[PDB]
Amino acid sequence: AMVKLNPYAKIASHKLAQVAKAQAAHKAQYAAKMEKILAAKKEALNQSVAKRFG
Amino acid sequence: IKPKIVKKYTGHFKRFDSNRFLRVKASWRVPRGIDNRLRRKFKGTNLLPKIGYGSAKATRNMLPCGLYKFPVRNTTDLEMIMMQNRKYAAEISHAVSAKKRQEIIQRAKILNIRVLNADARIK
Amino acid sequence: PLSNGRNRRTRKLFKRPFRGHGLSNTSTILHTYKVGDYVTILCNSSIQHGLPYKAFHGKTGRVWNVNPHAIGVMVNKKVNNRIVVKRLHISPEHIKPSGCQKDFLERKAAVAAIRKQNIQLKKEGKPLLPLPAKRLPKQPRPAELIKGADIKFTTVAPLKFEELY
């Protein structure tokens, strides 16, 4: 019925399918980038907590 | 083929105050009294026949067999529903003797008409 | 419980305006009422002869007939559940020219002024003017900027109680 009532629903649903993948890529991209910074942040401890305990 | 005969109420609408007194019969008569417990529809006693109880139009006046009722008095009445043996079922009247019944019952077999009184006034 | 007098309950309804006693004006007896005008009835207790009924004081009516010394005025009176037509004959001293159509009669002039130009612009070929916009209730105001150069602020908070004695 949505297609019958609103024929634009096929165009607007296609965009919402593609935008859905865009946000997933945006999430995965910053996930690795922020994980790297978190990984580097971890290896600033394990050095600066061995230059206080000794 | 038979549509499900659905009933919205399978009980009897007994008259108010007919379970105490004997002069008041069990045939429905709507109370007109001012302080009546029933015409005001008090809770617990609020049972009156209202047109909403009416059964479905398609299956109204239909016997449980799926066929409407058609009463016949003689063998010549059977011919009135010999074309509609799938819609009407003969029912020999209660005054027809035990000799004319075997004429109607046998003829209803020839025209293939269901008879609801096939075991009535038997020997 | 009140009475059935003609002019009952008229201690403050017929009392003259403060410092308004004595004679009426001279434009009261000089205004020209023509048939079809909207006039307001206002009982004048200084002139008793022909005083209209106290139930018509302040009602607005239409002049239907202008007689040599009195002005016919017709008003609608309410009865049990129906509205009837009352046809009085009030002297000019007891009625006042109503300006109920003061606003309306100035809208007609504005439209008539425009329509006069449209019969000249059309004859000479110029694009004719558009009619005045209709009246609408106070519409929701739109969004408007506010400069930050001529602004000032005043903090608003509930006030500490100060005793009145």
Binding site: - | - | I146, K152, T154, T155, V156, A157, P158, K160
Partner: protein, 173 residues
């Protein structure tokens, strides 16, 4: 409870259209906040909503909701005698949190419902400026007490049973 920042101006003959009425209102939502703000103008500056416009209405989140501060609340409430002023001290991590305490204790100790209290000003005071007899004992550095006559804490509502097995004891905790 939430805190809002609301400003509005008056546009008519009585007031100049260059004065902005700021406010920091505390209300459960933003429609009970405007109601407090509009009636604060009308009862104080003769400004009616029909002759004014709302310019800004934003929430004010707490900047550091991880630090404990001693809040001081100046308020006025109406009693069956007259109208008084109170100044209560509260310890909480948010301005919107210390006000919520003010409504609960006032509605309990003084039995005055929340539509009688006008919050005037809420500020933060120092460690030694707490006049409350009970609040003064917990502001020190070396405060310690044993939480005694405890009751055993269940993980969630799932493990709570109507009838138990064995004897029940409290905890030194």
């Amino acid at each position: 409870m939430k805190e809002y920042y609301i400003t509005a101006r008056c546009t008519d003959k009585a007031h100049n259209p260059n004065e902005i009425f700021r406010s920091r209102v505390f209300a459960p939502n933003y429609v009970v906040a405007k109601s407090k703000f509009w009636m604060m103008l009308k009862k104080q500056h003769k400004v009616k909503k029909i002759n004014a416009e709302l310019l800004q209405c934003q929430p004010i989140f707490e900047k550091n909701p991880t630090v404990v501060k001693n809040y001081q609340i100046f308020l006025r409430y109406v009693s069956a005698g007259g109208i008084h002023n109170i100044t209560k001290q509260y310890r909480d991590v948010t301005r919107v949190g210390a006000v919520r305490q003010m409504y609960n204790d006032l509605a309990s100790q003084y039995r005055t419902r929340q539509d009688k209290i006008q919050l005037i000003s809420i500020t933060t005071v120092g460690d030694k400026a707490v006049k409350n007899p009970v609040l003064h004992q917990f502001v020190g550095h070396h405060v310690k007490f044993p939480m005694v006559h405890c009751k055993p804490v269940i993980a969630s509502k799932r493990f709570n049973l109507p009838i138990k097995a064995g004897k029940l004891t409290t905890k030194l905790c």
